[PDB]
Design a protein around this ligand. Structure first.
Ligand SMILES: Cc1cc(-c2ccc(C(N)=O)cc2)cn(C)c1=O
Length: 113
């Protein structure tokens, strides 16, 4: 493993802890959610993110954050606001962007000196 892969795996593990039922663990299929592919053109999930860390597909934390935001935005686009999926996506997006905030990333960058 590389230092970037270890940092991204840490962020991913802490994010997955916020989803204990594993609603974001695997891609959303049309069988579980009718007409999903008709609405969501750029799907994302924690598993695909985990595969991208392992394959070393992320060049920066910004790219990782963009995939995390895409996953949450997709759930908020497809699901109505009073649903379990929309509420969880909104909660985790907020929590994730605090964890990987510019403030927290600057403190980590300063500790790499
Ligand atoms: C619409 C939607 C459905 C799901 C979902 C994932 C797994 C399962 C299951 N129990 O197998 C059921 C529902 C997840 N997400 C993120 C969504 O937007």
């Amino acid at each position: 493993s590389t230092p970037i892969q270890q940092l991204l795996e840490h962020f991913l593990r802490q994010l997955q802890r916020k989803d204990p039922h594993g609603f974001f663990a695997f891609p959303v299929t049309d069988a579980i959610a009718p007409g999903y592919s008709m609405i969501i053109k750029h799907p994302m999930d924690f598993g695909t993110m985990k595969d991208k860390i392992v394959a070393n597909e992320y060049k920066s934390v910004t790219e990782f954050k963009a995939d995390f935001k895409l996953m949450c935005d997709n759930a908020m686009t497809y699901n109505r606001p009073d649903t379990v999926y929309y509420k969880l996506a909104k909660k985790i997006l907020h929590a994730g962007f605090k964890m990987m905030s510019k403030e927290r990333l600057l403190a980590l960058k300063r500790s790499m000196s």
